[PDB]
Design a protein around this nucleic acid. Sequence first.
DNA 1: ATCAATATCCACCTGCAGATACTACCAAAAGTGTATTTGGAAACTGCTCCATCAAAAGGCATGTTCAGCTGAATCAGCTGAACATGCCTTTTGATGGAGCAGTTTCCAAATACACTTTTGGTAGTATCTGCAGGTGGATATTGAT
DNA 2: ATCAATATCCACCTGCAGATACTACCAAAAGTGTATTTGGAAACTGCTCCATCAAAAGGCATGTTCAGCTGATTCAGCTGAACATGCCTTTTGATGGAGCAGTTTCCAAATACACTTTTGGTAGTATCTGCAGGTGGATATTGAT
Lengths: 106, 106, 95, 95, 82, 87, 98, 97
Amino acid sequence: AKTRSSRAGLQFPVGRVHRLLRKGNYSERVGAGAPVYLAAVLEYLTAEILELAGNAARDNKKTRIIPRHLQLAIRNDEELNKLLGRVTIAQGGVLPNIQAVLLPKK
Amino acid sequence: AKTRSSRAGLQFPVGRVHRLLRKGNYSERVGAGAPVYLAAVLEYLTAEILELAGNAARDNKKTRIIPRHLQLAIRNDEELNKLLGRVTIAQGGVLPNIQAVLLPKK
Amino acid sequence: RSRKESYSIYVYKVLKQVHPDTGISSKAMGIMNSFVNDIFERIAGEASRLAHYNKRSTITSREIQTAVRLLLPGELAKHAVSEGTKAVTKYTSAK
Amino acid sequence: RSRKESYSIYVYKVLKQVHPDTGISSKAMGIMNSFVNDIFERIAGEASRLAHYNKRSTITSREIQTAVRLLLPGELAKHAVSEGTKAVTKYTSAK
Amino acid sequence: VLRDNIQGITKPAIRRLARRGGVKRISGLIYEETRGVLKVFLENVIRDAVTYTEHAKRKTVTAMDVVYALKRQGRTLYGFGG
Amino acid sequence: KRHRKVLRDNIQGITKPAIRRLARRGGVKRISGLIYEETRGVLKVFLENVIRDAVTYTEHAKRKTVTAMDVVYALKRQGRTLYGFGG
Amino acid sequence: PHRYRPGTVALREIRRYQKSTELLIRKLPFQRLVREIAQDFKTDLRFQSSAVMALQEACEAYLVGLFEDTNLCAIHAKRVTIMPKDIQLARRIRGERA
Amino acid sequence: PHRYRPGTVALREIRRYQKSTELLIRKLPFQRLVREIAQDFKTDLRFQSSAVMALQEACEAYLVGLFEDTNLCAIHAKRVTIMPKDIQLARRIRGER
DNA sequence: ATCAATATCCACCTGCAGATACTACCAAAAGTGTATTTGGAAACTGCTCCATCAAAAGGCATGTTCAGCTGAATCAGCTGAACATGCCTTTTGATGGAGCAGTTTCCAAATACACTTTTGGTAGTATCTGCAGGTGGATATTGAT
DNA sequence: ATCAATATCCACCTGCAGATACTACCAAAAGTGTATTTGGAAACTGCTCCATCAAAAGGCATGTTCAGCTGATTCAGCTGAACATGCCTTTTGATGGAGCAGTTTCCAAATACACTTTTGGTAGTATCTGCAGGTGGATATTGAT
Ligand SMILES: [Mg+2]
């Protein structure tokens, strides 16, 4: 027996995605390739987030990713920022940003 | 044979609404009161709007309701304006409103 | 050829109950259709979520009711829960 | 005690693949878990709405794909679509 | 005499929109800026409308394609179906 | 049961220093003194709205406990989706 | 030779256009713009009449709204003249940008 | 004796609190507030402590963002001091009011 | 510039919570393998309704003139930042009790399903009229003097 | 102030673009009779959640001082509003045919159902390690001079 994930060369669980597509009342029927695609798409986006988050961990001289690194990653990336424009990352804080007119002198 | 709508005291179609709930993937199963309730609520809201719309057409010396009347009726009502605050009513225009600071001094 | 179902009719009945001497344009009636479908989806989708959040498999009038309370403003929500509660009663109280 | 499932494992595999020396806090893992479930719903919802607009009882990988195109931004979509099409093609040619 | 399609959205027209919007006085840079904003709006809506089209295997953009695009861009429009 | 102290005027536990801190995370360098009461009013409305909805979920579930999911679902309705508490 | 003072016609136009509901962009140029824009996503496309009218109703509605906010932004800055900076603030705050 | 000039600690604080992520309102008072308000909606309610934290994570993020928009409104009117009218405009343009 | 006050920086260092590590049980998935059902792609094509274009229509490009708005400069007043000082309240971490979320086991009640009547609701067609424009003359508003 | 220029309002008229009305099928509601499914009603757990007590710090409230920001004032210059019209782009309305939509067909793909096998979750114990929070102490930053 091969999992459908391995069949598809995915880390993310294709079967579980299938079930959830069923139990979620999204449509009568579910084509056999939808969960496969979907689980692929989710796996891709979570690889994308982890990549940039890891980088932000390494920049702050850290080995373990915390929410602040996810927040830095998402908010410095144009597209993730948009995909997550109306989402709040608990314990993430904000990007350092001070409006220029507020800085001293001229 | 008696229409569930007439039983329920409603102009709005209880059957159709039961069907629409069945075929929109909202849930596996639908209770019997659910479409009565919903139909009643839809009719209600329709009434309240038509009522105010009517008045606005009456107020502008007219017997036929047009989109404009619906726009005046909705945006001058605090709660309908809220319920429909992210909706464009085609051919509605906007309420007469001029900021005071733009009005001529003398 | 094939049938295009609308509410454009129940609306007209309601218009007549409310303003018997008043009539309505094509476009106006189009808006009223959009409205009815919009609100239908809003209430249905919210009810659908409630039922799923509680692992229930049935959209009963209680979900409808809660959804109405979540979607509608104060008085609007309240006159509506009455009307809907009333309708279920009358339908039930009917041999 | 009931089995509460999550994507923690899939997330941790992928984390090792891209940063093999890097760990994740349980709070951050919670965030990731929210993120996946959120996007799941978003895609599955757009797909549901899509099939329904086109009177199909079936959500195929084609609907997933369009949904992705609707939901995600430019470059992310392009790449997600490739990874998807790739996983399907490979899966289909693996029984 | 050739011209850019976008410049088809004329200063008079723009000024009219502004007036419906209750604006009394308008800087001259507004017109170009307004054209850019309008362009980004249409790009966004049409991209999604056309996506709905292609999914349907159609060669025509239907007013539902548009209504559905508007909906999901949170610009819901009443009076064109749906 | 036996007693349970009356809650009143607890909006005033959103103190001026706390409000000042939130504004600094928000980038604000100088703060008019009427901001503190204005902020408190804006916050009270935000909280009532979220809680009203969250409790509506609690009530519908026939519970007497407001869960993090009740809150998480309320926030989503209200277009303030929150990651990090389930869902 | 009679002459209205600067602002008197403008106010007048507001009062007029707030009263009416006609579209204010000429149809053909709007329609050509739709098709230019659409060509970039897919070639050789046709548009239902109404599908182009829905867009025009949508844009016009959108833009008239943005001008309300834009105007409020000018008035905040103690002006009465709307500049692009006002449009940018409004869009920023609405969350369309930045 | 020593004195930092007006603004200088202000900018210090901004850097400090934009670098960190801890909740800025005290926990206990926030909790009371939550309980008061809920109590006015329904009596005899209990709260998962995480529900209260979700609320506080959410409120604080909401306001920090309101203060960003509020600030841009001040700077748009060539001030550096945020005022109630700034909050009011930001909220209007967001569609809150 | 030069000098002193203090905030900032960073790097090493121990206690420890929170992370990772097994181990093992197993219950709930997920998979595998027939038997069964059908959704929708595929092909054919009828007929809306969309692109194209000719003549009719009326909105807009233009350049000049100066009203009044914007933005710069100055400045007096007073508001809000900084900070020192006094101590109240939140934080932290116990401990008990119970109010209540969370399950499981049995049915009566409710809702789905396959099959047949019986309309209510739609498309296609047939009358019917509200009001969009037109004109005429009184009346109001604006701006010059 | 009065007086002219011109915009606005109001009363009345009338053809026809667009309502409302009528008819006649028929898809899909309703009625009927079994075939599942479900949401509790009771009846128990182990939790989390509430309450409360005591110690302690860590932040809050307050009053004083005055730096510098806001808003008032004044003003010159620049920049957008108002202006008349024929050139030209848009509007209107008539006409082939592109393709949307109607229909029918059938099999590759879906559900369904009963097995068989595996994995992901948790819970019991065990180990570990990243880094939070404390420590000087060497390197800025700021503001008085
Ligand atoms: Mg109270």
